[model samples]
Target: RDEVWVVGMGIVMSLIVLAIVFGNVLVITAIAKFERLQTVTNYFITSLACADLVMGLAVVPFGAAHILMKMWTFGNFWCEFWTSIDVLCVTASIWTLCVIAVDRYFAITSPFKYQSLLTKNKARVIILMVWIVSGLTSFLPIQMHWYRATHQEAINCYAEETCCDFFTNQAYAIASSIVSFYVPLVIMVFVYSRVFQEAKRQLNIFEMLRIDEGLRLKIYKDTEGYYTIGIGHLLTKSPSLNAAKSELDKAIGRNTNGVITKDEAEKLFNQDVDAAVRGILRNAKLKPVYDSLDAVRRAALINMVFQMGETGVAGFTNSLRMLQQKRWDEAAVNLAKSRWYNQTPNRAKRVITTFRTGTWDAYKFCLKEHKALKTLGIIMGTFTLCWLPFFIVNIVHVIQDNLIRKEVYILLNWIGYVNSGFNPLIYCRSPDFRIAFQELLCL
Candidate 1:
């Protein structure tokens, strides 16, 4: 029974070490080796993997063996050194994960501003802050003898002892734990929950647009009997025909036959429309400014872009300016004052009305209140539910001057450590990471 138990423990510990090391190494190599993968977002992934790599390399392997032994045979010097590295690396890893969650939250919620806001230098600063805070918390107490009780002698004391005299001051222990783990976990849950809500809103909008655009595809023929299969876009000979053809081709490839099926044409038409919208914003040098608007305003502008060419949409400079300022009423009024609006008053009215009113019930745009609250409650509740019993047990141990069961310690620590192995999976939501992983593994 004892031999079997030892084998089981070793197998579990070895798997944890392998997962942490291999998973993070892949993440680091993909970001560092791929030139295109070096973005503000991937930078955070790289930093996170760096911390996890340290944990796996410097902490986990030896620490797991130490845990199984149930006593420190590794001398006082090695014990202090290993304890400091373990605490510092794991705390740094968690803080890095928190930073990543914040980066992703902004990227999802404020994509337009994300590039400008989370510049490389700013990302470096945040990463630096993670390490700085981790170092202070991990090293400060040990250096200051804050782990020593008033009656205990310093030289022979060990943290791995049954008494677990890890910290002399109860308040510092609580504060340090919260800052290093609990608070960051709460912040991440809140941020990711909100991101999930925004994602749902964006998906719904795209789905509605897909249905609407599908009905708009139609077929027309010019004098040459060549069919132009799209939303009434013609291939007729005219001064602007070449420009229209070029623009359409830029959106979707040119159709040599000029004959296309309704479904095929609709797909191309939607692609063209999307490209036109993006192209207009890009050419105007207002892509970032355009992105700062609410979803309704973005949809309205995309409609205007599809109707007017880039130059024609340039006529809405005043309206665009109002939108950039986030002056919704003024922007709506200016939207109607444009030449594009005057050319098609009915289209203009519909677009502007939706722009102004679409986000009016702002809560509904991101998520319904009940849904948001329910999601948040679930996030917080599950987190507390998982660890609350352990927390209560630890508090009781503290009060009764006792130590937690070794099995409980092993379970909690391993569960927390397992999170590092999954950080890459969480970051995989970014398509670049997915592509990089595929390329790395030849998958």
Candidate 2:
């Protein structure tokens, strides 16, 4: 090499050498010096950086010098030493990456178990095992003349004055290749895919807390041009406003003109809410993950359907995909870009927080089953509430014959008899029971 090229390469290699040394040095020192930074995970990071530090010191500078001078000026013994260090440090670096992958998997998927598995002493032991395996594969074969000694003396680095090089014969090549490269490569790739997948799931599952909410009963103009009824019921679904009047007459016992009472309006709104929930349950895309979500996320999506019709909400395809894919923050950001977002940003702000924070403060809105579970709890717990009077009368009539009236006893007996028929209603209420019944019917 010419002096110009040599000098230029020297400076370039020096800059790279400086970067590797100082960068790893910062990582190592930060973990060693700070108590907070002294986590088992950070210790594995430090173990990784240590390999780079050795590479910068023992391998890179020597290789850079050989490049600059265009010859191995160091003695033959030093050549072997440099080659061994190069292999060892590079192997150690990659093995640490393998360890780091498993560590992250542990901390994420089996987080509680990781405390025992990756304690400080155990982490150090694991790191030592990494170096031991790296050393056995790299240094052991290189120094012990498993392959290199014959190749170097007969036709390569030892016989050639200018060359400082490395190679392997058949057995050593396959063994070391399998040990230092292939296994770690496969481990990291396999572990990383599931790591990120589980990580996204865990991140979306992250958060608790508390967004504005308003509902207007009766038909009115919205921020958009649509003539929606109570809590976004599309009145246009009917033949006309006259159809709504006819519908209200059936729901309301005595209907005046077009006006509805607050309780009646809420009752109508509940139907829309139930319909929105049923829409989600019927859809194939939302159905799979719907059962997995917390109340906060489930409610936000339900509220969205109520605000915009099911078809309107379906327009947010990418946003829904991101949410279902469990990239929470990005999903919310994507939601912000939708065309409907500009129409009513206030509701979007509140709904996005539910996605962002996963908190209950977003809305009280949830599925009918969750509400049904509440009602079911009461019914199951207070089992004989309606039928209790009949049991009491039977006991009292036995104790005091004259105290119990014949008419009262007759009414109480019929009430308990009605409960026997009502008992079957519980089995049909829950979703699983419905499926059980539906499947049996098919059979």
Candidate 3:
């Protein structure tokens, strides 16, 4: 029985290690080696890779050995420390993803504001906060022995591992869920929803603009054709056909009724076209029935880029500092850097979005020409698929560990390994990311 158990666990652990190591190595290489990939968003990925690397390097060996022996050799403290580090890094990874979602949301929905509002100083501050928060969240309860298992199933009631009984202990369960799962999940859902909405809005705007421009062009061409016809008639008329024309000429005198009219209409149109275009540009652009769609494709794309940028840094400071109770100081430092006076050499960053302040925002405006549901679906689906299995496992472990016991841990380990695998898939699949990686690395 013992041999069989060891063999089964060894097999599982081996697969887990292979998947985790291979996937993470690819992720790290894709980011680190890819030149065009450098950005603040990549920073979050760096942090995530760093966290996953730590978890894999630190936790798996200890776990595999323990399972192989079905006994604890490291004593209570090593167990506690290992478990705490696991919790810390895992929570940090999750919160970082949430931060990424928020970043993406702002990028797509309000690119101008996001660039101007989310600065490097702000990013650093957020990173600081995340680490602090992660440390506190992982360490505090364990220090209190809040969820720690009081007795061991092996070794005559001696504690075998670091913090256990997380599910049966109401305080620990509540706190862990709140800090590690619920809060981050809530934030992700909200931010992603907003991102998707903004993407749709930009797409719609793009479609509308295209339709209106087409309609205007068609009308201008038709009017030009009519004027040309009238001008030809004026130049080619015969006097034998004149008497009948005389009456018609009198009628034409009244506002060129079917006559050439000295290009007066063209001159008038030239003077007022700009005003007309402006009036109908927003909320009232006209288009053919078949072409009645809003576009802001460029704007949405820019927004997505902006969002991806912010996601890069979300892990560094967003949750970590808050977990450590250092958020206030970080926020203060960021606030100080928000001014031109605080910026070195006397200028704050500027953008092509003249009004909002960033080239990123201007790009967003350009995309706000076509509405596409695709962007939203991709983001939502990516996050959901990547995180959901882990989330469900955590929830199960939190709510019902006593009855399920070791099985919960085993399942959790499997899901955790899976999380590390999915990230590179999202990054490498994106053409923009591939190009960006090449560009950034080459530089």
Candidate 4:
């Protein structure tokens, strides 16, 4: 690489690396400080951010060195250690993202039991499983002494750029990418699609009518902020005076030909009237809103999964494939052909605005069944845009390698380094994540 070009690329790369580091740090800090952030999904987020941070800090610096120098200078031991950590951390990040998707799938589809099954403690255990599995996957090759015994080689940690060097077997690349990238990406797509459908099913307006009419009436009153105390106290103490006044007012307000008989007036003071009032008061205090905190939490988890699914499916693999194939025109087409593109701009803007607010209003906005697909489209599309450049670079590599007759693989090796950089920007835009950051690290 030329000095000017290297420096220019270095500055861009450095900025992205900073974003990933700062973003992931926020994730860890947010969860650690906040009690609410202690849920299972958050634990995975923290693990993911931690793994990404390690990559940004540990991996990118060495990678930059390899890029500038055009060869690995770190000896064999550091080589193995580097490769293991790189594989492990990347695997862990993807695994955590997959777990987040699964969490969402259960939440929207099985709203009733999701809470019971995916409690904070259970989430913790599940996150533990994610890290352990990720560790096992990353460490197996290194621990089994897969590399070499000949230079009397010790099992080292740092592979630097040598790990991805072509002379080295490409098996590691395929294996790591398959388990950490491809499999998780496929799982997320399936799970999120199902979750979106289930969420739509639950959001059906007709289904809401299945609850009691009284409950429905209570829903209206709950929004008005009323209690029995105000009306009941007045009616009970001054019943005779109010009834007489009401009778006269009713006679003047309505046509006199159609009158309320005395017996009907007295019926207002019947036992059932008081009973009805009391029931209304009680119902006012205890009305069921569409979905409670548990419901909102489940929805949030699903949204998280949707976000990660896109990150994996659209984020890493697909974008790179498109870039490698030199499909820029097709990439641009994919970018604009989002699921929500057909919706009226007003409707789409309203929904996006609701989400940006990060309030109960956004949760309510999502109550419409068709909204999940729109959300999925937005998420996937966003990933495609944010990551498409790396894909373009991959195509550049293929062109340079095959046509240009340069054995020099353009910077396809740097795609992981580049891709890991965007997560922090994504997190900062999330109100939930912003609040989580404050909670996890204020101490």
> Cα lDDT of all candidates, in order?
0.62, 0.61, 0.50, 0.49
- State candidate 1's TM-score: 0.59
Compare candidates 2 and 3 on lDDT and give the better one.
Answer: 2
Q: Over all chains combined, what TM-score does candidate 2 have?
A: 0.51
Give the runs in model 4 whose Cα sits over 4 Å from its true position: 113-116, 143-173, 206-410, 435-443
TM-score of each: 0.59, 0.51, 0.56, 0.54
Steric overlap count per candidate: 0, 1, 67, 23
Candidate 3 C-alpha error for residue 29, in Å: 4.3
| Residue-level lDDT tens digits of model 3 in 76-137 | 77777777887887788878767767776666666453332467567657766887889898
The digit string of per-residue lDDT tens for model 4 on 1-443 reads 57899899788777877877877777677777667656665566577677878888888777677667767787656656676787777667666666766776776666452332477777778777877887888777666655332321122312333443422223544454567666876686677667655654454212221110112111011112221121111122233544534544453354323233434333432333344323323442211211222333223222222222222223323323443354534533443355432432333333333223323343332432334234433443344343344434434433353342223233544655555666655555455666665555563
Worst 10 residues of 3 by lDDT: 346-355
lDDT of 1 by residue, 316-432 (tens): 677777777777788888777676567666556666766677642332322332242343334334434544454456555666756766577657766656656766665465566
CA displacement after TM-score superposition, residue 245 of candidate 2 (Å): 50
Order the candidates by lDDT, highest first.
1, 2, 3, 4
